[PDB]
Symmetry: D2
């Protein structure tokens, strides 16, 4: 059972909009919206979306596996060894939000301070004492962006696994000699940095020049979660405010995917006339180039929706019915919709490019979709005895080293329930960078934005006020 199996199972159920049923449903963690800061929904005047991994949630592990295969094939076609063709995607290895250290070729799971929680070199998980040669303070400067790359999105899952596959391969293939910063093959030296760059380039290439989009659109039922409740929720949002789309994808791809998401023999409700996906938006903007979108952005262009090409010139006109925009900036949305930032709830899956940036640069209110939560919540509840034991052990230890061996063991067994790289949100009792960023920048979060359907228009989402230690 993947997290997308969980999402599609809930997608298959029609909405029971009876008030009491809705209240009952949203008690379950799976259908809940979680609250980091209080938010009065009555004050939201605009609902903003992105498409990829928010409206269009790609099925797992099929879509990751497709991306992986195509990226591998691209590396082989540019000269990587034939053995890469024996690799096969393994969904049990990667967790999202890991950091690739391009100097030493390690995948690192870190906390908000850059402290090391896990370190894997290829598939070798390096124990604490042995990480000290390379990380003498068990720490990285995680904003040293020339050295460290943060794998934030679900699109980064294939490369997360591939990086580990490649380090493992070169390490164990006697044609190469392993060095601290890369591999020697006679008079050729491949640094981990250059290897990483090749992987990144190949992933970009697969998406923008290769066959990934074409292979996705030829089998949308295999690759994309589909939910009759989507048009219902968007139609309801439009009854109380404005609705917009700001996507990094292009118009041709957006139109294919969105047409699929709205392809039912009805509109918002069974029995209602089907309506084109575009009719659900007051403003549609493609090629957004987030995160630059939230600063200077790019020139505002108009899409010719017949051809899918941009009209020539910068668009200087007003918001009009049927127009589709390309590029621009977050100021375009505000200006054209007559909104200030706090009037907007932006619904994103990219912790950096959607959530952190809209919050910090523009003061937008935020909703983070975290698809893996659909399955992490099941693990959390099913294995809760392990976390609770860990908690008791931490308490007992603090109440002034056999206990320390036990803490490592329980931490490991708990973490393995999630995958080889553990929970998205923690390793044992230590929170991840990703968890910290979710708490700090996402006002609301959930396994799916669909969970807003279970709360009324006027709902006041509440979080407890925070007190400093000296105020308690």
């Amino acid at each position: 059972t993947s997290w997308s199996d969980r999402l599609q199972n809930a997608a298959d159920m029609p909405a029971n909009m009876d008030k009491h049923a809705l209240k009952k449903y949203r008690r379950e963690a799976y259908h809940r919206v979680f609250v980091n800061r209080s938010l009065a929904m009555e004050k939201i005047k605009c609902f903003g979306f992105n498409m990829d991994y928010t409206l269009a949630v790609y099925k797992s592990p099929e879509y990751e596996s497709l991306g992986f295969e195509l990226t591998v094939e691209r590396l082989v076609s540019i000269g990587y060894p034939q053995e890469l063709l024996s690799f096969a995607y393994d969904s049990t290895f990667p967790t999202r939000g890991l950091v690739f250290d391009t100097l030493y070729g390690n995948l690192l799971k870190v906390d908000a301070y850059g402290n090391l929680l896990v370190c894997a070199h290829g598939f070798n998980f390096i124990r604490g004492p042995e990480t000290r040669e390379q990380y003498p303070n068990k720490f990285i400067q995680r904003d040293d962006t020339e050295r460290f790359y943060i794998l934030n999105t679900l699109f980064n899952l294939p490369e997360t696994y591939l990086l580990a596959c490649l380090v493992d391969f070169f390490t164990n293939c006697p044609r190469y000699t392993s060095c601290e910063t890369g591999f020697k093959d006679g008079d050729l030296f491949m640094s981990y940095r250059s290897m990483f760059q090749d992987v990144r380039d190949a992933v970009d290439w697969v998406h923008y020049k290769g066959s990934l989009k074409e292979k996705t659109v030829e089998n949308l039922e295999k690759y994309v979660v589909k939910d009759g409740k989507l048009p219902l929720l968007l139609s309801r949002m439009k009854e109380v405010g404005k609705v917009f789309l700001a996507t990094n994808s292009d118009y041709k791809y957006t139109d294919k995917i969105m047409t699929y998401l709205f392809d039912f023999p009805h509109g918002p409700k069974p029995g209602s006339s089907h309506r084109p996906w575009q009719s659900y938006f007051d403003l549609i903007l493609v090629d957004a180039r987030k995160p630059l979108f939230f600063g200077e952005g790019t020139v505002l262009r108009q899409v010719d929706t017949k051809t899918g090409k941009l009209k020539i010139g910068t668009y200087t006109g007003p918001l009009q019915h049927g127009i589709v925009y390309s590029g621009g900036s977050s100021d375009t949305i505000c200006d054209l919709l007559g909104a200030k930032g706090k009037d907007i709830l932006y619904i994103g899956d990219h912790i950096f490019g959607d959530i952190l940036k809209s919050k910090k640069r523009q003061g937008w209110q935020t909703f983070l979709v975290i698809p893996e939560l659909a399955q992490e919540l099941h693990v959390w509840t099913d294995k809760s005895s392990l976390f609770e034991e860990l908690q008791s052990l931490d308490i007992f230890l603090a109440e002034l080293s056999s206990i320390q061996r036990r803490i490592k063991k329980v931490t490991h067994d708990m973490d393995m329930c999630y995958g080889m790289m553990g929970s998205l949100f923690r390793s044992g009792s230590r929170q991840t960078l990703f968890a910290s960023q979710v708490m700090r920048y996402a006002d609301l979060y959930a396994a799916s934005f669909i969970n807003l359907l279970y709360y009324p228009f006027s709902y006041l989402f509440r979080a407890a006020h925070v007190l400093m230690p000296h105020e308690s």
Copy 2:
């Protein structure tokens, strides 16, 4: 009763080192060390200090008043109007950590997200509706460092007040015409940005070229808190680890101030031989240039301690007894003391330059001194009925607008107990940027670092583990 009166009253008391007395003393909030993240003191191998406003806590409001007067005098001497000489420092106006908006000439108190909590134009406190012309989303991009200046340190208190004095003066003096971004005096236009720069330049000048240091050292009892417990605590630290000083000040000034701080007719304890201040440090580093110190730093130099001048050349030698360093980097400390970052507890008063930077760049453990806490804690406890009422009102309102007028009123009355700009840490129920940064980057904090004297060597400082909303 200023916060420095509180600190000096506690300074005047000799240490009662009986175990039970120490435990009893540190129960009181005034003598407590507060904990944001757990910290095992047994693991600290080095104790690091800065001097200004940490070891040498300048008395208030005398020292602020001196800085203010000298800065005013410098502005007049470069051509500002004679009316400035009628200004007098008012300690009830400024709170630390405000942001000066150089575009519109406002002092702003903001939360961690850049939301406006207070906005004052000169001495006019601008109500919420009226801030909307200049701040349509009641928000600033607080990292837009070309526009906004964050007044982080106690050295910034005089300029905080002076900026407000100047805006008030020019606004109400009929020689000038008030414009959105500055003042017109015939064919001269003074922007708030250029005014701010003149103030900043004059404060720097007073410190580095003018008479502030000379006037301070000629009356140290008036200007600097002095505590017989200082040598005691430093001597105890040196029994269990290494002790270092990294100060932005120069050696001549450092030697004058430190000699004063250690000028008692005894050493660590009454009855013990007096020892020179330098004997309390394994490493002494001046001209540190924090925050650059925590990145590339500057060339390591050696001070000639006879002359107070730098020896010519970069110092390439080892740590030796009696040597004093100048410049260098945080790596100098680690290398020469044989320490890794987590072995170090750095004791600072500069939330940005000492605490945030050492934590984020180097993974040092941190202790933030907050001198104002010595008096804010008294207000917090004495006026607790007001905060508690505010809390109940927030609860009652949330449990689904006469109440909203009451929330504004109680928020205002509470805030005024601290000063015209409120508590360092909050406005009503909203936490400040400074509070957020204290919680995020300072592992420990207190009104004085002296409060470490009341905890044993082995102490385990404990903070509760943090859970995400979906983990609760």
Copy 3:
């Protein structure tokens, strides 16, 4: 008769290597090497080449016309209007080295100081008085690289003409309104800057992603000058020094073009065995990325010459027989050939990327190929009575305004003999930027590098010493 007709006519003649015949031949300006600074050929130890427009001189106007057509087709395919398909390349319009002003949409011919010599808006040549609204000092800041683009190479001839075609089109098409900085088409505004960028992007696209290379290689006799004397001269160079190729082109294309250039039923001389083109080089380097090549360059890679793909990794080995390099830096050449800069004669056609940069950054000796000289020399000699009249008029005027109308007229008639944009090297008595840069950075220059064949190994190229006015 195009300049390439002249070059191919001389190419068709076999070499008569008799000493007296060679001396006689090199007296004619067409077969001469011209000298800006003295150069002792005996001191040259390495001869360096580029390929495009040096070894491989594309035929004119056929190749320009092909580039033009394909660029037009690309613009139409991305949404430019269908009328562009009626454009046809006109070799009589563009001269090389013009500056496009992206603010006002003008092609400018300037001197070394940025003084305006010609200004054309579309096909409207703007008289002096009328240029003053846009250029009040008849001057541009020609290093303001964000505004001005210098069209240095023969590859830039199609876009030179196309830019003028586009400004003319939009100006005269009543669908658009002409503004100072671009064109309005309803709610779309196309700046001259964005138009320019589209043209530049389309030219790049045609070369790197489109069909230009494929169409060139399918008819090499139509598109590329071929000369049996090439292998002869390169073989002679190799008898007295080392020979290298540093080309911005890729290996696959290089191999196709070079194989064509050496495809004769003989090697260096008639009667000799044919040898592969690679055998004529001690070092072959592709993907050079000049001008970056002459600074930091890029990582040194090795080409797999079977596949045409790069081997994975940086190449750390020595110079070996049969190896082909990719990327690297000018230091690669020096290190691997055991050369210092003054030992190298680099033979280039790019005044900036080959000549100025190798001279200024590395102190290489330089030879500039200027293919248009093959026809400009004919005009210069045939119309010499016009220049001589201009000279006499300048003299007579200086010897203290009917004469000034005559100077404009004669200047215009002279310039028109070269084309609508005049000589590469001057407008009337004023030298162009290009001329100045040739004199300043090219030690030697000629219509073809083949002209070195007519000078012996030991030749001392001589230029007169320069004296300052006060030294004369």
Copy 4:
């Protein structure tokens, strides 16, 4: 006889303004204006000046010696060794325009291409073969501004000599060990780069914080050339155009120096009323900050001429009688005087900051003052047999190595007639960087701007037109 002795001897002579006398006088090279590009004086509408070393020509070697002494004293006061006090300025060592190589501690005299003409390490002049270890291609990348510093102005003569003194001292003092990039003194390493920076800082300090200005103004007759013909020429300029001053110096110093320059018991002519120096200018601008002045510049300020302080605010008014400006940009001059660049003749002594920048950035016409020419012209004429022999030897050698030993010897004997670093303009037959820059950027040049007095208002300065080798 120094160059300033020559200038003051000519200064002492009253002007004979008879037409025939003026024509006769300007035939002599000493009183001539030299012409790099033709310039019609009738077209000049504004005459612009700088003060230091143009209007105010400091006497030599007295002023250099003063600067040297004060700089030495400053270095000793910050910790340099006492032996520096034994140094004494030697005017026979430095020539202007040398390059200090901060890596290897050499003074270099280079041509326009960065080729080495002379290399001195301290006072050791390094022969050609021995320069090859450090400069393998006898070349530097002279725009590598982090490594190389170009000593352009007469203010740089003291530091030119001091740098050589210091390298010599440390090299020969057995307390220090000489290394490739600096000197070791036990555990202190002084790089040539840090030494250079100390010298540069000390020269700045002497000028802006120390006693140089005060010592100059207390003995102006010792330190500043004074000429009754100055007011005459400026008065004549004002009869036919506008006159402005743009100086990097401050108003207080400018007023002292200018008052001295105009302190005669007459105005322009004997018998005429004395007039204040300010009356000779339509526009007076101080604190110009050239070269930044010719780009963005700084905020335009107004000087209070009573106090010498800046009025507070940016000056937004028109040009008015008696106003004095500070900061601004070259656009300030043009706007306020109603001039375009080619209407302006700017008279400067700084080849980079006055001449190159005004020409290249703004298209101003230029006049370079070169005070040393007043004595170099005497050497040039007196030792002309040596240059002529060198010329004949170059000719004879070229007409196909005993001759090469003779060329080195004659080159050396010629160069020594100018000083140990040779002529400003050449070493033997090779022109210097400075010479090249004079020819390229200075339209006119002379030993003094006073030489304009000897040419009528309408004069047409003529230079021969330049032809390319293929045009001859």
